[PDB]
Amino acid sequence: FFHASQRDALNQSLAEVQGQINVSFEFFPPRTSEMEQTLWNSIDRLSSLKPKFVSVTYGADRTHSIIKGIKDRTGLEAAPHLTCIDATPDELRTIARDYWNNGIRHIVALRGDLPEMYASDLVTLLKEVADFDISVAAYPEVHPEAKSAQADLLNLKRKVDAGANRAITQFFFDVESYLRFRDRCVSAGIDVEIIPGILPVSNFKQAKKFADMTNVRIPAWMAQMFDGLDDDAETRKLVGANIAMDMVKILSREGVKDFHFYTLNRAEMSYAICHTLGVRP
Amino acid sequence: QINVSFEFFPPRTSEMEQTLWNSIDRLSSLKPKFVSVTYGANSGERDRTHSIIKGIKDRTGLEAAPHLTCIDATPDELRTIARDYWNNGIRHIVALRGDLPPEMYASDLVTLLKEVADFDISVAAYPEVHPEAKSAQADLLNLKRKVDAGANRAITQFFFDVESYLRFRDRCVSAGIDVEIIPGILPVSNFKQAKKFADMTNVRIPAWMAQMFDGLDDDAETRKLVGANIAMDMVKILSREGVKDFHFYTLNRAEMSYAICHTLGVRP
Ligand SMILES: Cc1cc2nc3c(=O)[nH]c(=O)nc-3n(C[C@H](O)[C@H](O)[C@H](O)COP(=O)(O)OP(=O)(O)OC[C@H]3O[C@@H](n4cnc5c(N)ncnc54)[C@H](O)[C@@H]3O)c2cc1C
Ligand SMILES: Cc1cc2nc3c(=O)[nH]c(=O)nc-3n(C[C@H](O)[C@H](O)[C@H](O)COP(=O)(O)OP(=O)(O)OC[C@H]3O[C@@H](n4cnc5c(N)ncnc54)[C@H](O)[C@@H]3O)c2cc1C
Ligand SMILES: NC(=O)C1=CN([C@@H]2O[C@H](COP(=O)(O)OP(=O)(O)OC[C@H]3O[C@@H](n4cnc5c(N)ncnc54)[C@H](O)[C@@H]3O)[C@@H](O)[C@H]2O)C=CC1
Ligand SMILES: NC(=O)C1=CN([C@@H]2O[C@H](COP(=O)(O)OP(=O)(O)OC[C@H]3O[C@@H](n4cnc5c(N)ncnc54)[C@H](O)[C@@H]3O)[C@@H](O)[C@H]2O)C=CC1
């Protein structure tokens, strides 16, 4: 009936969007020789998809090196992450110029976490220190430390007004949440795209942990979807890929033409999802 | 409230033999309503089909339905085979005619089986019409004949255009065919092989699907994920349309069908 014809149109419209969807991949500095091997293999694999750009997380660092290793190994725009943790404004400016003179003109401005300065201040700083393409974080399901939804929302506009080139959302599994949030944004005056951050889930346990610490919700249907798969890595991957592909299908239909993938240094899942989006070698 | 069944085929090599039993153990934990095994005239013969059925029965205690064709087989041979199965606990048979290399049609086999014993009988249905049918009307009338002859249920040829199945089911009901029209689901991980199958059976492959597998000839892992996504989508749609039974053409592989069943609520 309707559900049948709807899926056909939805799959067809996605098939036609092949070629005009931008994707970016997020990685993290490896802590072992094994993970280093995995990372550089995922980078080589995902590079064939010619992403808009790739980013590297910032702890508290090999971040700078990896960025460098990428820009010259593949020649892709590498955007390093930067926080306000354990660093003074003077040091920050140092690092800033230390990147600009290295070909790095794209940075993901973030506050960071501790076990007194906000992201907004870092945005203005990078803008005060130079003119980088600032990418900040957005939270469709409100950041934990936010006073209220509107308060958190107003902060994003504050970061955008500060000079943020674009916003990248925290991962989510409730598509409605993202959509209504994106509406709330434009309805608030923010004129930048709220690029959805996609987390392809193969390890539900880890994913559930991340969610609890980021105030992200795990809809019941999803919890049921992975229930009983603790010892079935292969099935978890198929189920996880299915969920991600469906999510990115709905978003694509809703006009979203940009996606940021939390690869966790793995390429296959993100690679497959991109494939369904028309992003191929 | 969803029931499932899995179809396997007689292995022709030691490696496939290994693969098959690994899949049987894996899938058996899902407690399928029944499992079936195909028949290949020039690819295994009925002894190989019989062998697998006996193996499944003795090893899992699951209902195993052998596929039986009436081509190049005399009525007396068929009765002998039928009686042999029945006395050995095999009470479900997928009655098929088999491809012509007229004699007797599937409906004739159904009638012949019911005479031997009160067998549980499943017959083939084609949402996109059997390729040799004089017409869609005649092909449907034939399904009616097979059901009227004693067929307990119909199992459709695989399809990728879900609406073709939905429209077909409606025609069956309008035709008075009251048995269940169980959709045959083909999870695709090897598109080239699936396209060959589809082309030989006039099963339509939607443009979006052909595009989905384009460029993955040497990427088995991506084909699996894409295929699983397509399959899970289909069963979800079908499930919402009242389908309570699914038959999986596992091709002797378990992962894809296992995952799909999981997303359907069918778990160990
Ligand atoms: C794409 C992405 C990448 C990330 N990468 C990393 C990484 O590499 N390294 C890392 O350490 N962390 C990373 N994080 C996590 C992030 O640093 C944490 O979520 C952290 O809690 C700070 O958030 P923020 O950067 O959005 O800062 P902010 O935008 O400052 O938001 C944090 C909180 O401060 C509140 N707020 C802002 N201004 C004010 C004000 N003036 N008064 C009162 N309240 C205010 C906000 O409402 C919010 O609750 C990432 C997150 C995303 C979504
Ligand atoms: C679930 C399923 C399982 C299968 N398993 C196997 C298997 O294990 N082994 C194997 O060899 N094949 C198998 N097949 C394939 C099948 O045997 C072929 O499609 C075969 O050509 C027809 O078999 P049937 O049982 O549908 O025969 P029938 O139902 O007799 O149909 C065949 C054709 O004859 C027509 N017809 C019926 N009566 C008449 C009449 N009196 N005059 C003229 N035309 C008539 C029908 O409209 C149709 O075109 C399977 C198919 C399905 C869908
Ligand atoms: N989206 C988020 O909320 C992110 C938060 N972070 C925080 O910054 C820290 C330093 O970065 P790394 O060196 O990469 O840490 P890490 O090496 O301990 O973690 C590696 C990667 O796992 C993922 N991850 C870890 N904790 C996460 C969380 N709570 N939520 C979502 N994803 C998470 C991220 O991709 C991270 O890059 C992380 O430990 C984490 O606390 C980092 C990336 C994303
Ligand atoms: N569901 C269907 O349409 C089936 C059709 N058949 C036909 O009967 C012939 C003889 O049987 P086998 O010796 O097993 O052949 P085979 O040995 O060439 O094929 C082995 C198995 O692969 C699967 N298969 C092959 N072709 C298929 C098709 N077109 N559609 C769906 N599944 C297919 C079946 O499980 C079959 O048992 C097959 O070659 C095929 O043409 C057999 C089983 C199922």
From Swiss-Prot, chain A:
Result after altering E26Q: Abolishes enzyme activity
Induction conditions: Repressed by methionine.
Binding site for NADH: T57, Q170
Coiled coil: none
Top-rank taxon: Bacteria
EC primary class: oxidoreductase
Recorded catalytic activity of this chain's protein: (6S)-5-methyl-5,6,7,8-tetrahydrofolate + NAD(+) = (6R)-5,10-methylene-5,6,7,8-tetrahydrofolate + NADH + H(+)
Keyword terms: Amino-acid biosynthesis, FAD, Flavoprotein, Methionine biosynthesis, NAD, Oxidoreductase
Disulphides: none
Keyword Cell division: no
Pfam families cross-referenced by the UniProt entry: MTHFR (PF02219)
One GO cellular component, as annotated: cytosol
Statement: the UniProt record of this protein carries the keyword Electron transport: no
Gene3D superfamilies from the UniProt entry: 3.20.20.220
GO biological process terms on file: methionine biosynthetic process; tetrahydrofolate interconversion
GO MF entry, a single one: FAD binding
Residues annotated as catalytic: E26
Subunit structure: Homotetramer.
Other known facts: The reaction proceeds via a ping-pong reaction mechanism, and the two chemically and structurally distinct substrates can therefore occupy overlapping binding sites.
Protein family: Belongs to the methylenetetrahydrofolate reductase family.
The protein's name: 5,10-methylenetetrahydrofolate reductase
Gene: metF
